[PDB]
Amino acid sequence: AWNNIVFYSLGDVNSYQGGNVVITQRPQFITSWRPGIATVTWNQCNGPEFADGSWAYYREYIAWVVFPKKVMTKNGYPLFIEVHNKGSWSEENTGDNDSYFFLKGYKWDQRAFDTANLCQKPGETTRLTEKFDDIIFKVALPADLPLGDYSVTIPYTSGIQRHFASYLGARFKIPYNVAKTLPRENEMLFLFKNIG
């Protein structure tokens, strides 16, 4: 029995306009899943690296989003991040104090012969076409946050865990503490103006 797990990390930088906000309110921003070029940043393998189309293996794919619960403005003030709508994402390891963990398994126990690289190494790339739900977050502003324009960089991880296995019923989940330290190549640039 063998198991091959590869994590393909997406990395886009986009902006969201929060507009004028008063420090009492909890402004909203929408994180979108964007299909594109993904880069391997993690893997764990003990099986064959390559399938030639002539023999079967089993697929489990799981989408990941690892998102900060806290971000600092460039002028040194703390913003706290809350979930408003996680859609169909599975919000897990909720007791972690630094990061949210969202998972979405969209393929499991799928027998395939397809020719493929079953253990791509870090730095290798591929096109991800899969599309997943928006995740909507809120922001708590500190009461003494200086007035003016903010452009807050919020790094986070998103990508797909590909799990190839030798047998039917293979389940694997990248450990949270490992997922916790993965490169956060996505950036949400949250824009708003703090008024009164």
mmCIF file of all heavy atoms in Angstrom, residues 125-169:
data_model
loop_
_atom_site.group_PDB
_atom_site.id
_atom_site.type_symbol
_atom_site.label_atom_id
_atom_site.label_comp_id
_atom_site.label_asym_id
_atom_site.label_seq_id
_atom_site.Cartn_x
_atom_site.Cartn_y
_atom_site.Cartn_z
ATOM 1 N N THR A 125 4.708 23.032 -11.931
ATOM 2 C CA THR A 125 3.452 23.755 -12.110
ATOM 3 C C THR A 125 2.406 22.957 -12.884
ATOM 4 O O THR A 125 2.718 21.966 -13.545
ATOM 5 C CB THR A 125 3.682 25.102 -12.829
ATOM 6 O OG1 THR A 125 4.236 24.876 -14.131
ATOM 7 C CG2 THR A 125 4.630 25.979 -12.024
ATOM 8 N N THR A 126 1.159 23.409 -12.784
ATOM 9 C CA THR A 126 0.056 22.853 -13.557
ATOM 10 C C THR A 126 -1.104 23.840 -13.560
ATOM 11 O O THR A 126 -1.173 24.724 -12.708
ATOM 12 C CB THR A 126 -0.418 21.492 -12.997
ATOM 13 O OG1 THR A 126 -1.201 20.814 -13.987
ATOM 14 C CG2 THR A 126 -1.254 21.665 -11.732
ATOM 15 N N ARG A 127 -2.014 23.681 -14.515
ATOM 16 C CA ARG A 127 -3.202 24.522 -14.585
ATOM 17 C C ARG A 127 -4.339 23.902 -13.781
ATOM 18 O O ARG A 127 -4.767 22.781 -14.062
ATOM 19 C CB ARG A 127 -3.642 24.717 -16.039
ATOM 20 C CG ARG A 127 -3.804 26.170 -16.446
ATOM 21 C CD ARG A 127 -4.031 26.362 -17.949
ATOM 22 N NE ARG A 127 -5.368 25.957 -18.390
ATOM 23 C CZ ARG A 127 -5.754 24.712 -18.660
ATOM 24 N NH1 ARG A 127 -4.905 23.698 -18.579
ATOM 25 N NH2 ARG A 127 -7.006 24.493 -19.045
ATOM 26 N N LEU A 128 -4.820 24.637 -12.781
ATOM 27 C CA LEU A 128 -6.006 24.235 -12.030
ATOM 28 C C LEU A 128 -7.241 24.921 -12.597
ATOM 29 O O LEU A 128 -7.274 26.146 -12.724
ATOM 30 C CB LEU A 128 -5.860 24.568 -10.542
ATOM 31 C CG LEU A 128 -4.662 23.967 -9.806
ATOM 32 C CD1 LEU A 128 -4.648 24.435 -8.363
ATOM 33 C CD2 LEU A 128 -4.688 22.448 -9.872
ATOM 34 N N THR A 129 -8.246 24.121 -12.937
ATOM 35 C CA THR A 129 -9.469 24.615 -13.565
ATOM 36 C C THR A 129 -10.628 24.650 -12.575
ATOM 37 O O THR A 129 -11.625 25.337 -12.802
ATOM 38 C CB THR A 129 -9.873 23.747 -14.770
ATOM 39 O OG1 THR A 129 -9.884 22.365 -14.386
ATOM 40 C CG2 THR A 129 -8.900 23.952 -15.923
ATOM 41 N N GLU A 130 -10.497 23.893 -11.491
ATOM 42 C CA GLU A 130 -11.543 23.809 -10.477
ATOM 43 C C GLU A 130 -11.856 25.176 -9.865
ATOM 44 O O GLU A 130 -10.956 25.982 -9.634
ATOM 45 C CB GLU A 130 -11.129 22.817 -9.384
ATOM 46 C CG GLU A 130 -10.825 21.414 -9.912
ATOM 47 C CD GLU A 130 -9.345 21.169 -10.171
ATOM 48 O OE1 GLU A 130 -8.643 22.115 -10.583
ATOM 49 O OE2 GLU A 130 -8.888 20.021 -9.980
ATOM 50 N N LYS A 131 -13.140 25.411 -9.598
ATOM 51 C CA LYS A 131 -13.626 26.671 -9.030
ATOM 52 C C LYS A 131 -14.488 26.403 -7.798
ATOM 53 O O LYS A 131 -15.337 25.513 -7.815
ATOM 54 C CB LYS A 131 -14.416 27.451 -10.088
ATOM 55 C CG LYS A 131 -15.271 28.606 -9.566
ATOM 56 C CD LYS A 131 -14.423 29.774 -9.094
ATOM 57 C CE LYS A 131 -15.287 30.884 -8.521
ATOM 58 N NZ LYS A 131 -14.489 32.100 -8.207
ATOM 59 N N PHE A 132 -14.278 27.183 -6.741
ATOM 60 C CA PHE A 132 -14.965 26.960 -5.470
ATOM 61 C C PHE A 132 -15.619 28.235 -4.940
ATOM 62 O O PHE A 132 -15.451 29.313 -5.510
ATOM 63 C CB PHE A 132 -13.983 26.403 -4.438
ATOM 64 C CG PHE A 132 -13.378 25.088 -4.834
ATOM 65 C CD1 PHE A 132 -12.179 25.044 -5.525
ATOM 66 C CD2 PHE A 132 -14.012 23.895 -4.526
ATOM 67 C CE1 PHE A 132 -11.622 23.838 -5.901
ATOM 68 C CE2 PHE A 132 -13.458 22.685 -4.897
ATOM 69 C CZ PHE A 132 -12.262 22.657 -5.587
ATOM 70 N N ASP A 133 -16.364 28.096 -3.846
ATOM 71 C CA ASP A 133 -17.166 29.186 -3.290
ATOM 72 C C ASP A 133 -16.350 30.374 -2.795
ATOM 73 O O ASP A 133 -15.201 30.234 -2.376
ATOM 74 C CB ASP A 133 -18.016 28.683 -2.118
ATOM 75 C CG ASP A 133 -19.097 27.716 -2.545
ATOM 76 O OD1 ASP A 133 -19.323 27.563 -3.765
ATOM 77 O OD2 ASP A 133 -19.730 27.111 -1.651
ATOM 78 N N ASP A 134 -16.968 31.548 -2.851
ATOM 79 C CA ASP A 134 -16.437 32.717 -2.173
ATOM 80 C C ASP A 134 -16.410 32.451 -0.678
ATOM 81 O O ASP A 134 -17.241 31.707 -0.163
ATOM 82 C CB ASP A 134 -17.292 33.957 -2.447
ATOM 83 C CG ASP A 134 -17.245 34.403 -3.889
ATOM 84 O OD1 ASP A 134 -16.329 33.981 -4.622
ATOM 85 O OD2 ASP A 134 -18.127 35.192 -4.284
ATOM 86 N N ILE A 135 -15.448 33.051 0.011
ATOM 87 C CA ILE A 135 -15.468 33.089 1.467
ATOM 88 C C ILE A 135 -15.528 34.557 1.876
ATOM 89 O O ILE A 135 -14.664 35.346 1.496
ATOM 90 C CB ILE A 135 -14.236 32.401 2.095
ATOM 91 C CG1 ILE A 135 -14.073 30.985 1.534
ATOM 92 C CG2 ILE A 135 -14.362 32.380 3.618
ATOM 93 C CD1 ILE A 135 -12.816 30.265 2.005
ATOM 94 N N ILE A 136 -16.550 34.916 2.647
ATOM 95 C CA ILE A 136 -16.745 36.302 3.061
ATOM 96 C C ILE A 136 -16.291 36.484 4.507
ATOM 97 O O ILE A 136 -16.728 35.758 5.402
ATOM 98 C CB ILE A 136 -18.223 36.735 2.914
ATOM 99 C CG1 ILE A 136 -18.678 36.561 1.460
ATOM 100 C CG2 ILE A 136 -18.398 38.181 3.357
ATOM 101 C CD1 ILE A 136 -20.119 36.980 1.182
ATOM 102 N N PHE A 137 -15.410 37.462 4.716
ATOM 103 C CA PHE A 137 -14.877 37.786 6.038
ATOM 104 C C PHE A 137 -15.304 39.168 6.528
ATOM 105 O O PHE A 137 -15.678 40.030 5.733
ATOM 106 C CB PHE A 137 -13.346 37.701 6.033
ATOM 107 C CG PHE A 137 -12.808 36.332 5.713
ATOM 108 C CD1 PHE A 137 -12.466 35.983 4.418
ATOM 109 C CD2 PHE A 137 -12.642 35.393 6.720
ATOM 110 C CE1 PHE A 137 -11.970 34.724 4.134
ATOM 111 C CE2 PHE A 137 -12.144 34.134 6.442
ATOM 112 C CZ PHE A 137 -11.809 33.798 5.148
ATOM 113 N N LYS A 138 -15.237 39.362 7.845
ATOM 114 C CA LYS A 138 -15.414 40.675 8.460
ATOM 115 C C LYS A 138 -14.135 41.127 9.143
ATOM 116 O O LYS A 138 -13.271 40.312 9.458
ATOM 117 C CB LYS A 138 -16.520 40.662 9.507
ATOM 118 C CG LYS A 138 -17.895 40.330 9.011
ATOM 119 C CD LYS A 138 -18.863 40.453 10.173
ATOM 120 C CE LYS A 138 -20.285 40.632 9.718
ATOM 121 N NZ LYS A 138 -20.809 39.307 9.354
ATOM 122 N N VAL A 139 -14.033 42.432 9.379
ATOM 123 C CA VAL A 139 -12.875 43.017 10.045
ATOM 124 C C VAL A 139 -13.297 43.874 11.232
ATOM 125 O O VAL A 139 -14.132 44.765 11.099
ATOM 126 C CB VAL A 139 -12.048 43.875 9.068
ATOM 127 C CG1 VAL A 139 -10.831 44.472 9.764
ATOM 128 C CG2 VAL A 139 -11.638 43.048 7.858
ATOM 129 N N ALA A 140 -12.725 43.594 12.399
ATOM 130 C CA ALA A 140 -12.927 44.444 13.567
ATOM 131 C C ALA A 140 -11.816 45.481 13.620
ATOM 132 O O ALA A 140 -10.637 45.134 13.666
ATOM 133 C CB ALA A 140 -12.956 43.618 14.838
ATOM 134 N N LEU A 141 -12.196 46.755 13.600
ATOM 135 C CA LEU A 141 -11.227 47.843 13.662
ATOM 136 C C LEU A 141 -10.978 48.235 15.113
ATOM 137 O O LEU A 141 -11.897 48.184 15.928
ATOM 138 C CB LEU A 141 -11.714 49.058 12.867
ATOM 139 C CG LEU A 141 -12.151 48.801 11.423
ATOM 140 C CD1 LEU A 141 -12.602 50.100 10.766
ATOM 141 C CD2 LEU A 141 -11.034 48.147 10.620
ATOM 142 N N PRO A 142 -9.731 48.604 15.449
ATOM 143 C CA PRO A 142 -9.503 49.091 16.811
ATOM 144 C C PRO A 142 -10.050 50.508 16.965
ATOM 145 O O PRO A 142 -10.064 51.260 15.989
ATOM 146 C CB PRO A 142 -7.980 49.046 16.954
ATOM 147 C CG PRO A 142 -7.461 49.187 15.573
ATOM 148 C CD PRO A 142 -8.495 48.599 14.647
ATOM 149 N N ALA A 143 -10.486 50.864 18.171
ATOM 150 C CA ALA A 143 -11.191 52.125 18.396
ATOM 151 C C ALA A 143 -10.312 53.352 18.156
ATOM 152 O O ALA A 143 -10.816 54.425 17.823
ATOM 153 C CB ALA A 143 -11.751 52.158 19.811
ATOM 154 N N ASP A 144 -9.002 53.183 18.319
ATOM 155 C CA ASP A 144 -8.049 54.280 18.163
ATOM 156 C C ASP A 144 -7.351 54.247 16.802
ATOM 157 O O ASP A 144 -6.301 54.867 16.622
ATOM 158 C CB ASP A 144 -7.013 54.244 19.286
ATOM 159 C CG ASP A 144 -6.193 52.970 19.285
ATOM 160 O OD1 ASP A 144 -6.724 51.918 18.870
ATOM 161 O OD2 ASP A 144 -5.016 53.020 19.704
ATOM 162 N N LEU A 145 -7.931 53.524 15.848
ATOM 163 C CA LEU A 145 -7.362 53.444 14.508
ATOM 164 C C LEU A 145 -7.349 54.835 13.880
ATOM 165 O O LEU A 145 -8.399 55.467 13.772
ATOM 166 C CB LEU A 145 -8.164 52.481 13.635
ATOM 167 C CG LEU A 145 -7.556 52.142 12.272
ATOM 168 C CD1 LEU A 145 -6.304 51.283 12.426
ATOM 169 C CD2 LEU A 145 -8.581 51.458 11.382
ATOM 170 N N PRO A 146 -6.164 55.325 13.470
ATOM 171 C CA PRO A 146 -6.108 56.663 12.867
ATOM 172 C C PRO A 146 -6.996 56.808 11.633
ATOM 173 O O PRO A 146 -7.151 55.860 10.862
ATOM 174 C CB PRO A 146 -4.630 56.813 12.483
ATOM 175 C CG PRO A 146 -3.907 55.902 13.398
ATOM 176 C CD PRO A 146 -4.821 54.734 13.606
ATOM 177 N N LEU A 147 -7.577 57.994 11.466
ATOM 178 C CA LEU A 147 -8.399 58.297 10.302
ATOM 179 C C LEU A 147 -7.559 58.241 9.036
ATOM 180 O O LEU A 147 -6.353 58.480 9.080
ATOM 181 C CB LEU A 147 -9.036 59.681 10.438
ATOM 182 C CG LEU A 147 -9.837 59.961 11.711
ATOM 183 C CD1 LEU A 147 -10.320 61.399 11.724
ATOM 184 C CD2 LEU A 147 -11.012 59.004 11.825
ATOM 185 N N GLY A 148 -8.198 57.914 7.916
ATOM 186 C CA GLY A 148 -7.541 57.957 6.622
ATOM 187 C C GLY A 148 -7.664 56.684 5.805
ATOM 188 O O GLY A 148 -8.358 55.736 6.179
ATOM 189 N N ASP A 149 -6.958 56.671 4.679
ATOM 190 C CA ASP A 149 -7.004 55.557 3.745
ATOM 191 C C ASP A 149 -6.132 54.401 4.212
ATOM 192 O O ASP A 149 -5.030 54.607 4.721
ATOM 193 C CB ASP A 149 -6.561 56.011 2.353
ATOM 194 C CG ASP A 149 -7.584 56.901 1.678
ATOM 195 O OD1 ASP A 149 -8.614 56.376 1.206
ATOM 196 O OD2 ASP A 149 -7.353 58.125 1.604
ATOM 197 N N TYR A 150 -6.645 53.186 4.044
ATOM 198 C CA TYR A 150 -5.884 51.977 4.329
ATOM 199 C C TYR A 150 -5.832 51.060 3.117
ATOM 200 O O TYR A 150 -6.801 50.940 2.374
ATOM 201 C CB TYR A 150 -6.485 51.232 5.522
ATOM 202 C CG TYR A 150 -6.212 51.918 6.836
ATOM 203 C CD1 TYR A 150 -7.050 52.918 7.308
ATOM 204 C CD2 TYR A 150 -5.105 51.577 7.599
ATOM 205 C CE1 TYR A 150 -6.797 53.552 8.505
ATOM 206 C CE2 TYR A 150 -4.844 52.204 8.798
ATOM 207 C CZ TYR A 150 -5.692 53.191 9.245
ATOM 208 O OH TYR A 150 -5.436 53.820 10.440
ATOM 209 N N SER A 151 -4.673 50.442 2.922
ATOM 210 C CA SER A 151 -4.473 49.438 1.885
ATOM 211 C C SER A 151 -3.775 48.248 2.530
ATOM 212 O O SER A 151 -2.546 48.173 2.558
ATOM 213 C CB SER A 151 -3.656 49.998 0.722
ATOM 214 O OG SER A 151 -3.526 49.043 -0.315
ATOM 215 N N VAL A 152 -4.573 47.325 3.055
ATOM 216 C CA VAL A 152 -4.072 46.267 3.924
ATOM 217 C C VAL A 152 -3.781 44.974 3.166
ATOM 218 O O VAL A 152 -4.684 44.361 2.601
ATOM 219 C CB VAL A 152 -5.081 45.967 5.051
ATOM 220 C CG1 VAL A 152 -4.493 44.992 6.058
ATOM 221 C CG2 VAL A 152 -5.505 47.261 5.739
ATOM 222 N N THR A 153 -2.517 44.562 3.172
ATOM 223 C CA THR A 153 -2.118 43.315 2.531
ATOM 224 C C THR A 153 -2.415 42.148 3.466
ATOM 225 O O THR A 153 -1.927 42.110 4.597
ATOM 226 C CB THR A 153 -0.616 43.315 2.170
ATOM 227 O OG1 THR A 153 -0.331 44.409 1.289
ATOM 228 C CG2 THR A 153 -0.213 42.003 1.499
ATOM 229 N N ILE A 154 -3.226 41.208 2.988
ATOM 230 C CA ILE A 154 -3.613 40.041 3.777
ATOM 231 C C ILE A 154 -3.186 38.763 3.062
ATOM 232 O O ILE A 154 -3.937 38.222 2.253
ATOM 233 C CB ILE A 154 -5.134 40.016 4.036
ATOM 234 C CG1 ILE A 154 -5.577 41.338 4.674
ATOM 235 C CG2 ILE A 154 -5.501 38.842 4.937
ATOM 236 C CD1 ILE A 154 -7.075 41.494 4.816
ATOM 237 N N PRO A 155 -1.980 38.265 3.372
ATOM 238 C CA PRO A 155 -1.517 37.018 2.751
ATOM 239 C C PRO A 155 -2.319 35.799 3.201
ATOM 240 O O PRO A 155 -2.744 35.747 4.355
ATOM 241 C CB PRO A 155 -0.056 36.909 3.213
ATOM 242 C CG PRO A 155 0.310 38.267 3.732
ATOM 243 C CD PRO A 155 -0.952 38.869 4.238
ATOM 244 N N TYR A 156 -2.534 34.843 2.299
ATOM 245 C CA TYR A 156 -3.189 33.590 2.667
ATOM 246 C C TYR A 156 -2.874 32.475 1.669
ATOM 247 O O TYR A 156 -2.442 32.737 0.548
ATOM 248 C CB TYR A 156 -4.710 33.790 2.788
ATOM 249 C CG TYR A 156 -5.441 34.104 1.498
ATOM 250 C CD1 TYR A 156 -6.069 33.098 0.769
ATOM 251 C CD2 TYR A 156 -5.524 35.406 1.022
ATOM 252 C CE1 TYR A 156 -6.748 33.382 -0.405
ATOM 253 C CE2 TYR A 156 -6.200 35.698 -0.150
ATOM 254 C CZ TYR A 156 -6.811 34.684 -0.858
ATOM 255 O OH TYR A 156 -7.482 34.980 -2.023
ATOM 256 N N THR A 157 -3.071 31.231 2.102
ATOM 257 C CA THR A 157 -2.855 30.063 1.250
ATOM 258 C C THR A 157 -4.155 29.598 0.614
ATOM 259 O O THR A 157 -5.199 29.567 1.261
ATOM 260 C CB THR A 157 -2.255 28.874 2.031
ATOM 261 O OG1 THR A 157 -1.033 29.267 2.661
ATOM 262 C CG2 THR A 157 -1.973 27.705 1.096
ATOM 263 N N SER A 158 -4.076 29.230 -0.658
ATOM 264 C CA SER A 158 -5.159 28.517 -1.312
ATOM 265 C C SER A 158 -4.543 27.564 -2.313
ATOM 266 O O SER A 158 -3.465 27.824 -2.848
ATOM 267 C CB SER A 158 -6.124 29.473 -2.010
ATOM 268 O OG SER A 158 -5.627 29.848 -3.284
ATOM 269 N N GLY A 159 -5.229 26.458 -2.565
ATOM 270 C CA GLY A 159 -4.715 25.447 -3.463
ATOM 271 C C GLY A 159 -5.444 24.131 -3.310
ATOM 272 O O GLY A 159 -6.419 24.030 -2.563
ATOM 273 N N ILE A 160 -4.951 23.112 -4.005
ATOM 274 C CA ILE A 160 -5.597 21.809 -4.014
ATOM 275 C C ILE A 160 -4.645 20.709 -3.563
ATOM 276 O O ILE A 160 -3.524 20.586 -4.057
ATOM 277 C CB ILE A 160 -6.146 21.481 -5.419
ATOM 278 C CG1 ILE A 160 -7.357 22.367 -5.716
ATOM 279 C CG2 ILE A 160 -6.533 20.004 -5.531
ATOM 280 C CD1 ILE A 160 -7.807 22.349 -7.163
ATOM 281 N N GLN A 161 -5.114 19.924 -2.600
ATOM 282 C CA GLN A 161 -4.426 18.725 -2.159
ATOM 283 C C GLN A 161 -4.828 17.571 -3.074
ATOM 284 O O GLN A 161 -5.982 17.148 -3.066
ATOM 285 C CB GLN A 161 -4.782 18.420 -0.698
ATOM 286 C CG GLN A 161 -4.238 17.109 -0.151
ATOM 287 C CD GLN A 161 -4.922 16.688 1.139
ATOM 288 O OE1 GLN A 161 -5.073 17.485 2.068
ATOM 289 N NE2 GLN A 161 -5.343 15.428 1.200
ATOM 290 N N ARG A 162 -3.887 17.084 -3.878
ATOM 291 C CA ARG A 162 -4.120 15.894 -4.693
ATOM 292 C C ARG A 162 -3.576 14.668 -3.971
ATOM 293 O O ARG A 162 -2.392 14.611 -3.648
ATOM 294 C CB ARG A 162 -3.466 16.020 -6.074
ATOM 295 C CG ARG A 162 -4.161 16.980 -7.043
ATOM 296 C CD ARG A 162 -4.019 16.481 -8.480
ATOM 297 N NE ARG A 162 -3.876 17.547 -9.471
ATOM 298 C CZ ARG A 162 -4.863 18.337 -9.883
ATOM 299 N NH1 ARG A 162 -6.087 18.202 -9.387
ATOM 300 N NH2 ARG A 162 -4.624 19.270 -10.794
ATOM 301 N N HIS A 163 -4.446 13.691 -3.726
ATOM 302 C CA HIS A 163 -4.055 12.464 -3.038
ATOM 303 C C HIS A 163 -4.241 11.247 -3.947
ATOM 304 O O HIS A 163 -5.366 10.839 -4.243
ATOM 305 C CB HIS A 163 -4.866 12.302 -1.750
ATOM 306 C CG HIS A 163 -4.627 11.007 -1.038
ATOM 307 N ND1 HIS A 163 -5.559 10.445 -0.191
ATOM 308 C CD2 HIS A 163 -3.562 10.173 -1.034
ATOM 309 C CE1 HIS A 163 -5.080 9.315 0.298
ATOM 310 N NE2 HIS A 163 -3.871 9.126 -0.196
ATOM 311 N N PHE A 164 -3.121 10.671 -4.375
ATOM 312 C CA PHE A 164 -3.126 9.449 -5.171
ATOM 313 C C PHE A 164 -2.791 8.268 -4.268
ATOM 314 O O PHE A 164 -1.858 8.339 -3.467
ATOM 315 C CB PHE A 164 -2.117 9.545 -6.321
ATOM 316 C CG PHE A 164 -2.244 10.800 -7.139
ATOM 317 C CD1 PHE A 164 -1.346 11.843 -6.973
ATOM 318 C CD2 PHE A 164 -3.264 10.941 -8.066
ATOM 319 C CE1 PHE A 164 -1.459 13.002 -7.722
ATOM 320 C CE2 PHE A 164 -3.382 12.097 -8.820
ATOM 321 C CZ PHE A 164 -2.481 13.130 -8.644
ATOM 322 N N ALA A 165 -3.548 7.183 -4.402
ATOM 323 C CA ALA A 165 -3.344 6.008 -3.562
ATOM 324 C C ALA A 165 -3.497 4.713 -4.350
ATOM 325 O O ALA A 165 -3.983 4.710 -5.481
ATOM 326 C CB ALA A 165 -4.314 6.029 -2.390
ATOM 327 N N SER A 166 -3.072 3.617 -3.733
ATOM 328 C CA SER A 166 -3.063 2.305 -4.371
ATOM 329 C C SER A 166 -4.367 1.540 -4.196
ATOM 330 O O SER A 166 -4.631 0.582 -4.921
ATOM 331 C CB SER A 166 -1.920 1.468 -3.803
ATOM 332 O OG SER A 166 -1.965 1.456 -2.387
ATOM 333 N N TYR A 167 -5.176 1.967 -3.232
ATOM 334 C CA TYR A 167 -6.337 1.198 -2.799
ATOM 335 C C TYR A 167 -7.612 2.030 -2.755
ATOM 336 O O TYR A 167 -7.572 3.261 -2.776
ATOM 337 C CB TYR A 167 -6.080 0.593 -1.416
ATOM 338 C CG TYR A 167 -5.711 1.615 -0.362
ATOM 339 C CD1 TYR A 167 -6.660 2.111 0.520
ATOM 340 C CD2 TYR A 167 -4.412 2.096 -0.261
ATOM 341 C CE1 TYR A 167 -6.324 3.046 1.482
ATOM 342 C CE2 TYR A 167 -4.065 3.031 0.694
ATOM 343 C CZ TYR A 167 -5.024 3.505 1.563
ATOM 344 O OH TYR A 167 -4.678 4.440 2.516
ATOM 345 N N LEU A 168 -8.744 1.334 -2.718
ATOM 346 C CA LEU A 168 -10.045 1.969 -2.582
ATOM 347 C C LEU A 168 -10.281 2.384 -1.130
ATOM 348 O O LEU A 168 -10.011 1.617 -0.206
ATOM 349 C CB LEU A 168 -11.153 1.019 -3.049
ATOM 350 C CG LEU A 168 -12.580 1.575 -3.020
ATOM 351 C CD1 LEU A 168 -12.745 2.739 -3.987
ATOM 352 C CD2 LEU A 168 -13.584 0.471 -3.323
ATOM 353 N N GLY A 169 -10.778 3.603 -0.936
ATOM 354 C CA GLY A 169 -11.103 4.095 0.391
ATOM 355 C C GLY A 169 -9.977 4.882 1.038
ATOM 356 O O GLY A 169 -9.991 5.115 2.247
#
